[PDB]
Amino acid sequence: PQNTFLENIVRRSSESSFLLGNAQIVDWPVVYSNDGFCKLSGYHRADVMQKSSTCSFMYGELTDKKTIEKVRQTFDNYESNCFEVLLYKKNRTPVWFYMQIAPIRNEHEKVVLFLCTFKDITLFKQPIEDDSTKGWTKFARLTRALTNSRSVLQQLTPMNKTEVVHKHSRLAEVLQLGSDILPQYKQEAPKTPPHIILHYCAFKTTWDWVILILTFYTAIMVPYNVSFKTKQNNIAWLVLDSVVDVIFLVDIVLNFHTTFVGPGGEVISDPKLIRMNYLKTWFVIDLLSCLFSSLKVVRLLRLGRVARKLDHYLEYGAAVLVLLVCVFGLVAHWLACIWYSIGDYEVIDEVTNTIQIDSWLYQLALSIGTPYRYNIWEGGPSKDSLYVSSLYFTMTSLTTIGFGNIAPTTDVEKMFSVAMMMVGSLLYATIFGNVTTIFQQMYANTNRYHEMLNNVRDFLKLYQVPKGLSERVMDYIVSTWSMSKGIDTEKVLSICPKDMRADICVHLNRKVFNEHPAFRLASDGCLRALAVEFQTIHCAPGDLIYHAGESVDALCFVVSGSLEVIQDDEVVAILGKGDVFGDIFWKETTLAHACANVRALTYCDLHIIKREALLKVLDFYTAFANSFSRNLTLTCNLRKRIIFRKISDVKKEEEERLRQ
Amino acid sequence: PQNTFLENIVRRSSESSFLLGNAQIVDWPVVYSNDGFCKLSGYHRADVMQKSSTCSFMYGELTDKKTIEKVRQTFDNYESNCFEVLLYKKNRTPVWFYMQIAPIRNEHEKVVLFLCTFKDITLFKQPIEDDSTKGWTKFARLTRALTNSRSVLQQLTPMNKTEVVHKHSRLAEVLQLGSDILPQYKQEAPKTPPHIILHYCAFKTTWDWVILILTFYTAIMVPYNVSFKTKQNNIAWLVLDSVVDVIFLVDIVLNFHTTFVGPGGEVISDPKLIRMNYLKTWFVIDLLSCLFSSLKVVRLLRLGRVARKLDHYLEYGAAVLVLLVCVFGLVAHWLACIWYSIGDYEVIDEVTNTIQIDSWLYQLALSIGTPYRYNIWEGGPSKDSLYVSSLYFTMTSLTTIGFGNIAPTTDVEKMFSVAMMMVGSLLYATIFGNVTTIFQQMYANTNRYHEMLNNVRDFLKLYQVPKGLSERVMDYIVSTWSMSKGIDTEKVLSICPKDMRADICVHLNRKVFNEHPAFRLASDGCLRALAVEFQTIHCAPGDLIYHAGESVDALCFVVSGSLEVIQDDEVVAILGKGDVFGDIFWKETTLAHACANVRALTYCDLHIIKREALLKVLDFYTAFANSFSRNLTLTCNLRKRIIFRKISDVKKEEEERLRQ
Ligand SMILES: [K+]
Ligand SMILES: [K+]
Ligand SMILES: [K+]
């Protein structure tokens, strides 16, 4: 969601000198100056900014009087025109310019900035100058002033009386740029050229899933047709092949119109580069795959598409497991096809006209019930039994079960089963490794929690901490890991540098900013500083925040629960739900003694800000410091003692007073 | 690629007093003084340096006048000679020296330094001295002055009239050291003695690979010939054994000429140590291996070479997997040989003349179709079937499949298969462990990324951060891990102490040094300091760098993208591609309030330098501070406010002015 507006202007201007200036401000100050205007005028792009976009500060002695007023109305009412003005450069050189004013538009059709395109026509006109000594001085400067607009732009007729042709060319340039000078200043979305498909669109993902399904179907079906002959053709299996072939041809055609992700950058939408990118990467595999035994078996090259498209899924853990189960099934099927091919070859030695007792097909025929007949040779098991038997055998050898119904007993079968076992061992090992890694991924976090728990327990047991204090520590550990689930705030906030840290911290401390009268005249910067400086704590019933002699160095705001400030074993304050206690740091400059114990009745919630951070923030911002001083009344100041005398003391002392 | 020049000089001088001095500088200052010249003259090697290499500061009263001039021309035109001079030591002792000047040469044949070898001939001449009281004082000092040159060098004829012999010896010494005094001062490469082969050469790696292939071939072939008899000799299997044996003899001969890597140091090229290093390490295994059943079976000791040479490959993960697959195959082959040996022994009990029904050879003969005949005993399976069957069986027991075609049923076979299973369990477990470690190696990094992603997601969900801000955080996380791929700059730059940190940081910030006019009069040290002090940030569209009240404490250089400085909801500046904004830290000494909001239009790229580091660098370097102050013009100073009044305000106020 970029806002590429300067990029479009510099891509369309083709070495121009646009002078973008603000519109809603009086005098229309200049906002941006291209580094082509720094040469046409001699002003560096630090002295031209914040000046009028009329170029009023280059208007001089003999500047055309009417043009100044006319461009003034042109800026008054928002409209676009073109002018020929006679300005002065930084060297007081009378030089002509072509003004191509064109207002810009906002998102919801509002004028925001004024664009001013400039061109130099010094050699194209007659710049009458007073401080001259010879006629030639009136000509050489013409070659000096125009260098990139005469030898580059108009060099075909550099002859006199063609100045009217130059004026006509300027008029044609200004008239035929109605939409080229208004790229609609706006925060837009990425745009693609016509007839280009985004690689992450909703259609492309569905197309990729369909291609994956079809590739798996072809991988399943091609070896079956190659090995289990099945040369009989039907209606429900001869049109599907053609449909899949034309679908893959459509995919090849449509893959020329995809947005290839750049090496570390973003998407590229240039048809002039994607075409040979695809050509050099994967135009060989697809062509051969989508074109006799070789022609029907080459279709297995379609797995390259599956390999390419499965990159983001391969990152996860369970996706690799599903992929490996799928390839396990596919490898079992392929080995079943090869096993049946061997078994069919070996039966019935063709040199003689006998049947080999060794081959697993003969043993399977014996164990099934249907034997071979005739001596041409006909009989044996049906076509479903052969495939299910081959798959069963090659699945008993990949899972390392090996029952022994169907087993190698011929010279070829044994030396093929050796390769079967060699491959299956590695495949099965990879499956085991993936499963154990998947389990370790979660048991890592669980064991990370349990290790800390065990370390705390062993530390408490080793130093014989008395019961009643170890219980509190263990309860705190359990409760904090229950509430937070091991999610530390500091590690998460370390990431996301200080643009989102401030926003997150302002959101977290919303319960001390929105509902408290001190933080209502604070600018956003001060609120961000305070939010990033607070930090928060969680209390538990019976826990003391301040003792009877601790140094108060924090302002604490209670957002949930109830506190109890007790002094001399007497309750002197009860706090809760919007009460602030602590000390007046900003006008005492001395750490105090906490005069009373602040216990927690219920499960409390406090946002405490340290003394130093608060003092720094209040020192940096002045007006908010006064507002905070005036608008903060502490409900329990833990610096001054409350002077009182209990009733029981009076009642006791009265007895002795009467006695004496 | 060392520059060992002092080492060669001290190894060749044999306790001399060379006085290396620079040549291209006037007066030829002394550069280095050996700690043998600190005794011949009494000058410590801190007062003799930066003095003339002519020893002009030891030239005294009665020094030989002609020799001073002659050595002066000898230094004038670059040439080597020898002189006999009469200098004074630190104690003003008239002492004779032998000068052996010899210029040194650069890489491309240039004179750089002048070498001056010295010797003492005090006792070898007549040092007439004035402050003497008795004749014996003219003799004892002769023994005092010469101690390491008379009792060590010339002690065979310590008799008078032999001083001419000493002069002849000095002449022979100086004449026959033409190349020994010029070791060609140059940054050379490691040099090996003639007829010594570098262990990491391109020939040695090919030789090692060939030896590995031959060792695997021998390991495959020797047990087959020992067990599967095959005593018939052919032409294609009797010369190969001799060729391999002579190749291994050549390897044994050639292993005496290898550069053994020292214990923690570098290669050693001393033939006097490598020979007994190899002799003590591995001269016993090779000799016996390269020398009846014992003689043909001892050739399996060649696996020691494989074990030795496979040390760097064993570090990786996949190499161990390939090695374990190879040893799995080799162990299966060896167990096949042992299994066939047992099966061949057990058939046909030789005490009687019957055939044992139990032995697996008989069952295999029944299941194949070819039975035993005769009762000497002839028939059975062919020689290919026996080996393929043995390998199949011992592969069904190592992969834990166990079909059951071929299975132990005799007393010996069962108690051998027990050991088979015991070994195979451990081998198969090791293969599984290696596979799971290999997978964990990469899933560690992937899970490390996913754990942080999940923690961020759970933190956002737990604290109910509103939508529209959690989306930005998640997008930032995804985008930064996409661009950087988890490669943190700080951890990489922590390594490589501050010689390559400076160079790397200068290279990274090349887009603010080369194309910016402030950094053009800065020495390399200042550029290194600034580069190591910058740090860089990446922005995103809509992200704010400075708010309306933040403290500007950084100079920011934009190298890619576009920024937008807006004040009072009005665009006042547009930045991009070489624009610097911030504050003038070096002449204000006060943190300011950012007067405007700096938003990012497109994906920006900023190099920001903090206030304190910049101030330290500009304080340490003085002239560059002035150059930086003069040559830096901020395009948007975020300290001063721009005073303006919008057009809508004027238009609105005019209506009320007319109304009243
Ligand atoms: K099994
Ligand atoms: K069985
Ligand atoms: K079995």
Numbering used by the authors:
A (entry chain A), B (entry chain B): 11 to 301, 320 to 403, 408 to 692
In the authors' words:
Six distinct configurations captured for hEag2 are primarily based on the pore dilation and ion distribution. The overall Cα atoms and the side chain of the two closed states are almost identical, while the differences are density peaks of the water molecule and potassium ion in S0, indicating that the water and potassium in S0 layer are dynamic in the closed states. For hEag2, in a closed state, the four pore-lining S6 helices form a bundle-crossing in the middle of the membrane right below the ion selectivity filter with two layers of hydroxyphenyl or phenyl residue, Y460s and F464s, forming the hydrophobic constriction sites through intrachain and interchain π–π interaction to prevent hydrated/dehydrated potassium ion flow. Below the hydrophobic constriction sites are hydrophilic constriction sites through intrachain and interchain electrostatic interaction of Q472s and T468s. The hydrophilic constriction sites together with the hydrophobic ones form a long channel gate. In the closed states and pre-open state 1, a strong and unambiguous density peak is located between the hydrophobic and hydrophilic constriction sites. The density is more likely to be a dehydrated potassium ion, and we name it site 6 or S6 as the seventh potassium ion selectivity site. If our closed states represent the deep closed state, we suspect that the voltage may act on both S4–S5 linkers and constricted sites for the hEag2 channel to sense the electromechanical force. However, there may exist a deep closed state (for example under −70 mV membrane potential condition), and our closed structures may still present a pre-open closed state.
